[PDB]
């Protein structure tokens, strides 16, 4: 019944890395059936961008009109804290409504990354789960990716960040791998991308040899 705007901020996975271009999403819901057409305006620090693109109207199962607009923004523009305003004007609406967003503002904190060897009891099971702890970053946005031998791994899970007592955030990332690969000796790396990190990247490393001391001394039992 009542129109509302949920302006989607660009995903950090796109904004931080060069590979993908960040996109800004403006969604209009509860659009009046008499006036399907909706007029859009875009403000960047008080200027109008000519790169705006629009999508055709979509009708869902609930017969609620929803209009989505996607905007291409440079990677560095979002990181600079530029204010982005989406303005919606329609005949049904008595006055246009503007929703503004910007990146979170605060003191940056360099996250700390640790790797955890798998538990001994996990050796009983066929599959073993690794552990990468990233803790101590004030901003909520962060990227975590597992990769081995130079290729990405598509079987991993990252927990949402959880606020700490001091205000920092911590999270765990787990990678499930079969036991034979762990016995082989292949290296696994949990890479973290954050705005406060130097060069916006940090890589770690874990393998079977990390647990073993640098002096090869353990022999066969009995």
Q: How far is the CB of 115 from a copy of itself (least distance, A)?
A: 6
Cα distance between residue 16 and residue 141, in whole Å: 9
Cα distance between residue 87 and residue 106, in whole Å: 27
Cβ-based nearer residue to a copy of itself, 25 or 191: 191
Helix (H), strand (E) at residue 134: strand 131-137
Burial of residue 147 (CB within 10 Å: 0-12, 13-18, 19+) is: middle
One DSSP character per residue, 146-208 reads: EEETTEE-S-EEEPPPEE-TTS-EEEEEEEEEEHHHHHHT--EEEEEE-SSSGGG-B---B-H
Q: How far is the CB of 218 from a copy of itself (least distance, A)?
A: 5
Q: How far is the CB of 68 from a copy of itself (least distance, A)?
A: 22
Query: Residues in the site for a copy of itself, rule: CB under 8 A?
Result: 16-21, 74-76, 79, 110, 112, 114-122, 125, 129, 131, 133, 135, 145, 147, 150-152, 155, 157-160, 162, 164-165, 170-172, 174, 176, 189, 191, 193, 198-203, 205, 209, 211-222
Q: How far is the CB of 206 from a copy of itself (least distance, A)?
A: 10
Cβ-based nearer residue to a copy of itself, 36 or 152: 152
Cα distance between residue 95 and residue 75, in whole Å: 33
User: Which tokens belong to 109?
Assistant: 């904190």
Cβ-based nearer residue to a copy of itself, 45 or 164: 164
Cα distance between residue 158 and residue 146, in whole Å: 10
Cβ-based nearer residue to a copy of itself, 89 or 205: 205
Cβ-based nearer residue to a copy of itself, 67 or 182: 182
By the 8 A CB rule, do 171 and 135 touch? yes
Q: How far is the CB of 14 from a copy of itself (least distance, A)?
A: 10
Cβ-based nearer residue to a copy of itself, 33 or 50: 50
Q: How far is the CB of 70 from a copy of itself (least distance, A)?
A: 15
């Amino acid at each position: 019944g009542g129109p509302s705007v949920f302006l989607f901020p660009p995903k950090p996975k796109d904004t931080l890395m060069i590979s993908r271009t960040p996109e800004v999403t403006c969604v209009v819901v509860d659009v009046s059936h008499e006036d399907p057409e909706v007029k859009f305006n875009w403000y960047v620090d008080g200027v109008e961008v000519h790169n705006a693109k629009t999508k055709p109207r979509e009708e869902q199962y609930n017969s609620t009109y929803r209009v989505v607009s996607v905007l291409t923004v440079c990677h560095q523009d979002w990181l600079n804290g530029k204010e982005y305003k989406c303005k919606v004007s329609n005949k049904a609406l008595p006055a246009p409504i503007e929703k503004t967003i910007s990146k979170a503002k605060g003191q940056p904190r360099e996250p700390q990354v640790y790797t955890l060897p798998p538990s001994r009891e996990e050796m009983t099971k066929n599959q073993v789960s690794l552990t990468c702890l990233v803790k101590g970053f004030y901003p909520s946005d962060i990227a975590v990716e597992w990769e081995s031998n130079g290729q990405p791994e598509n079987n991993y899970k990252t927990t949402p960040p959880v606020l700490d007592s001091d205000g920092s955030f911590f999270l765990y990332s787990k990678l499930t791998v079969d036991k034979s690969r762990w016995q082989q000796g292949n290296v696994f790396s949990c890479s973290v991308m954050h705005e406060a990190l130097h060069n916006h990247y940090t890589q770690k490393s874990l393998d079977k040899s990390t647990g073993k001391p640098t002096l090869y001394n353990v022999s066969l039992i009995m």
